[PDB]
Amino acid sequence: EDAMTVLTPLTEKDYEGLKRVLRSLQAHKMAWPFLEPVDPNDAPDYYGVIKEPMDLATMEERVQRRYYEKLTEFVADMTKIFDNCRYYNPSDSPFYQCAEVLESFFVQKLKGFKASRSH
Numbered sequence: 001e002d003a004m005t006v007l008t009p010l011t012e013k014d015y016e017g018l019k020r021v022l023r024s025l026q027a028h029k030m031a032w033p034f035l036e037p038v039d040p041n042d043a044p045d046y047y048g049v050i051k052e053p054m055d056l057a058t059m060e061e062r063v064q065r066r067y068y069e070k071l072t073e074f075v076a077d078m079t080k081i082f083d084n085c086r087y088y089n090p091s092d093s094p095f096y097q098c099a100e101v102l103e104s105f106f107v108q109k110l111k112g113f114k115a116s117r118s119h
């Protein structure tokens with residue numbers, strides 16, 4: 001990551017862009033596994049093997065409360081969603097596939113956001 005991403009505080013204008021990025025991911029057809037926390041009734045061992053769970057509803061709460069101070073912190077929570085999924089599930093599962101697709105989409109949107117901060 002470049003210096004602006006790591007070190008520039010998130011302004012109010014930056015926060016309007018983060019809200020838009022988040023809503024775009026929540027509207028994607030392959031985001032269904034990630035919208036809410038993993039349900040322990042459907043995966044009884046999940047919370048014993050994933051030490052730092054993350055999901056898009058937790059990220060929305062954090063955006064609304066202005067939790068993030070730097071773009072790097074927002075990117076780290078999003079990346080945790082996809083990394084947790086690829087560690088828990090096998091490479092041939094539909095869950096793993098959805099992580100591949102949605103991370104590519106996130107990177108496209110993140111590049112757009114970064115371009116809009118500066119010019």
Ligand SMILES: CC(=O)NCCc1ccc(S(N)(=O)=O)cc1
Binds near residue numbers: 034038084085
């Ligand atoms: C985001 C994410 O990784 N969700 C996985 C949810 C999930 C994984 C596995 C199963 S099982 N035990 O039926 O094979 C159920 C649900």
